Amino acid sequence: DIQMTQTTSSLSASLGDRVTISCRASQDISNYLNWYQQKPDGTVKLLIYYTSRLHSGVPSRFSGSGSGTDYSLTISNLEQEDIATYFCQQGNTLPRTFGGGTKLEIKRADAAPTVSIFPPSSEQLTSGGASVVCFLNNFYPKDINVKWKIDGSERQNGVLNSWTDQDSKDSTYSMSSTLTLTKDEYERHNSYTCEATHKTSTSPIVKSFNRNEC
Amino acid sequence: EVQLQQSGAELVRAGSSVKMSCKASGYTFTSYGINWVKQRPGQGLEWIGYINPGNGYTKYNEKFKGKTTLTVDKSSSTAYMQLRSLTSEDSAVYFCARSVYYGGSYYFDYWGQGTTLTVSSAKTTPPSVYPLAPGSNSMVTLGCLVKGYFPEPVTVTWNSGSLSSGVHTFPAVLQSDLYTLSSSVTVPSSPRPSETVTCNVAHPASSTKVDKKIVPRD
């Protein structure tokens, strides 16, 4: 049908800034675009309609333009409540399609994660399970790549990650990583490594332990 | 004030079917169309389809038709959506919204709180709280592993809440058809193991509450 593309998943800015998210149509919408705002608590509102330009009860800082294939929402002066996810939507041709959405996020100095490893707990091992966990706390920006190593190599299976939204006091992200094995498998190997690669340096932050040394 | 309250969240075995509610108030229910958008954590809002309450006329988006059926109740001014032959693919949050005209084409000006749908065959089952302690320098990080529980949610606090800052409770993730989550608290080294640092995980569905203490060693 009519694709809807927002080149940017996440957009950074500071309060007081003039923020512009963009949205591109696979074809000519002849000005039938609308803007939706979804706040973290999941609720969605209507900010603008009809090729942008049109409001609803929304504050003046909210502006909007475009035509044909390109269109964009501008928030002339960013305010805390404006931190949400914005989707665009072409109401020209059936079916009605949306845009991946552009989540804003506060700008913070680069930080670098605090990497921590943890061996399986006795209480778990006696169950016959064995999970090695790894926390990469309070880092920014939000892109980070973690890599597991069992006895100097491999390991992709059993690795389940979780990521937290941006913090509200400071604006850092955090990440949980768990590698699940079987007490037997776990016991067949010695060193386990959790390698955190972040743009904050070239050298991966490496934290690990050896069962033999426990 | 135009309002639209949707149904509570739902838990349903796949293959099955469900009918969720969207009740309007504060306006002529018959005068505007109802839409249904679906949202899966993998971002993006899909367009299920539209229904005009007055004529009962409907319009689906080919990818949703057949499994989906949009019906109203002009009497109690309340729109419905019935999803059939469910799968794990349509576990998401479903929104209903009001459609207005304005020159040339419609837009959605009012949404609902949405209803969360979860398609699982699991049944209420307590978690297994596992203490995360360092191995055998100013600040030290501990943790607690909550694994094997169903359904959501779980409440984790440290020392019954006395440790607010420096905590991190990651979203859950789907293990072998069961949930798992982790939480980390950071405290000066003077606090532990000098003092007690404990995690309190609460899993309502099973009416559970477990305090797991973080002791040194393994």
Side-chain angles (χ1 to χ4, degrees), chain A residues 1-6 8-64 66-92 94-214, chain B residues 1-42 44-174 176 178-218:
Chain A
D1 318 324
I2 297 179
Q3 232 185 36
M4 290 282 35
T5 295
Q6 299 184 78
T8 296
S9 354
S10 182
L11 186 53
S12 306
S14 336
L15 316 176
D17 287 11
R18 185 180 156 306
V19 170
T20 306
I21 316 156
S22 293
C23 172
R24 170 203 40 176
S26 70
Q27 36 189 297
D28 282 39
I29 298 305
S30 296
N31 287 61
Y32 289 113
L33 184 58
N34 298 290
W35 288 105
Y36 298 74
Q37 183 212 63
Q38 175 173 66
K39 281 177 184 168
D41 78 324
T43 84
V44 184
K45 297 219 166 294
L46 176 275
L47 293 173
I48 286 184
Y49 66 110
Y50 183 75
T51 183
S52 307
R53 193 276 138 230
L54 302 179
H55 270 53
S56 311
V58 17
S60 51
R61 79 188 95 134
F62 284 86
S63 160
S67 70
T69 286
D70 299 15
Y71 300 123
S72 36
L73 164 78
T74 293
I75 314 182
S76 64
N77 177 332
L78 190 41
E79 295 232 2
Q80 181 74 59
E81 52 170 32
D82 296 341
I83 299 292
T85 315
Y86 304 97
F87 303 99
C88 49
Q89 166 272 314
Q90 64 82 39
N92 176 358
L94 280 197
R96 294 288 165 276
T97 53
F98 282 108
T102 310
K103 185 124 124 170
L104 285 171
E105 66 109 36
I106 302 300
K107 281 296 305 179
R108 193 244 143 68
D110 289 20
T114 299
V115 180
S116 292
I117 6 70
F118 302 87
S121 64
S122 303
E123 192 180 337
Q124 182 182 17
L125 282 168
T126 42
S127 300
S131 302
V132 182
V133 179
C134 200
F135 302 129
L136 299 67
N137 298 339
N138 314 202
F139 57 75
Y140 177 62
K142 73 138 184 43
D143 294 272
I144 201 166
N145 295 298
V146 58
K147 180 179 178 201
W148 286 93
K149 269 174 179 186
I150 293 186
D151 291 321
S153 62
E154 82 182 297
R155 232 47 210 223
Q156 298 216 333
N157 306 37
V159 178
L160 283 173
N161 307 95
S162 245
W163 302 268
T164 57
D165 290 294
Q166 192 184 74
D167 197 73
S168 300
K169 178 55 169 199
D170 65 62
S171 315
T172 62
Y173 302 64
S174 287
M175 179 188 178
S176 163
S177 188
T178 311
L179 188 255
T180 308
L181 310 142
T182 50
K183 182 172 155 257
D184 287 338
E185 196 166 299
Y186 174 66
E187 291 196 320
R188 289 176 207 146
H189 301 88
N190 185 54
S191 61
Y192 295 82
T193 304
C194 166
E195 287 182 309
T197 300
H198 187 269
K199 92 159 188 188
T200 227
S201 188
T202 73
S203 315
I205 302 172
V206 195
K207 295 266 159 174
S208 53
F209 72 80
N210 319 336
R211 292 177 36 238
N212 61 11
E213 298 201 321
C214 280
Chain B
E1 190 207 61
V2 199
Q3 194 59 33
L4 291 132
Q5 273 138 81
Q6 284 199 238
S7 300
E10 292 225 63
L11 207 66
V12 300
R13 232 239 71 177
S16 210
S17 63
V18 201
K19 301 193 73 173
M20 51 193 63
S21 299
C22 173
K23 196 183 163 197
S25 107
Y27 79 124
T28 299
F29 179 78
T30 63
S31 184
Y32 307 78
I34 297 303
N35 281 78
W36 291 78
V37 169
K38 180 162 128 323
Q39 189 191 34
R40 293 181 103 197
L45 306 154
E46 295 185 354
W47 186 54
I48 290 188
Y50 141 61
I51 161 179
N52 180 322
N55 29 300
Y57 183 105
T58 84
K59 175 57 181 224
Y60 295 62
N61 155 199
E62 205 45 52
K63 99 159 141 241
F64 282 105
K65 203 170 190 167
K67 290 74 188 141
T68 318
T69 288
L70 298 188
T71 56
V72 215
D73 189 317
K74 300 208 299 176
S75 170
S76 64
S77 304
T78 288
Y80 307 83
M81 184 171 73
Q82 189 192 58
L83 296 178
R84 281 173 311 265
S85 308
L86 290 162
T87 76
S88 295
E89 155 213 335
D90 45 92
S91 284
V93 69
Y94 301 92
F95 295 95
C96 58
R98 198 180 71 159
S99 222
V100 171
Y101 185 73
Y102 182 71
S105 185
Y106 322 91
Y107 66 71
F108 323 125
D109 60 2
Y110 292 149
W111 303 60
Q113 7 67 70
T115 301
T116 298
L117 176 87
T118 286
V119 177
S120 191
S121 294
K123 296 295 190 324
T124 102
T125 161
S128 271
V129 193
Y130 296 132
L132 308 204
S136 65
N137 213 322
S138 159
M139 303 298 297
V140 62
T141 300
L142 275 86
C144 203
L145 184 64
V146 220
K147 152 177 162 43
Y149 72 74
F150 184 84
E152 295 247 62
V154 290
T155 300
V156 179
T157 53
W158 289 93
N159 273 341
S160 306
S162 321
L163 306 180
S164 323
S165 9
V167 179
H168 282 296
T169 299
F170 313 82
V173 320
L174 242 176
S176 322
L178 283 176
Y179 290 96
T180 295
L181 86 67
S182 41
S183 185
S184 83
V185 71
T186 274
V187 302
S189 278
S190 92
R192 233 264 334 182
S194 161
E195 295 170 61
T196 293
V197 180
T198 291
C199 27
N200 318 97
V201 330
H203 182 229
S206 45
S207 272
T208 261
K209 191 73 186 163
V210 167
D211 300 312
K212 201 65 225 116
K213 187 171 175 191
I214 329 294
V215 304
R217 193 152 70 233
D218 220 341

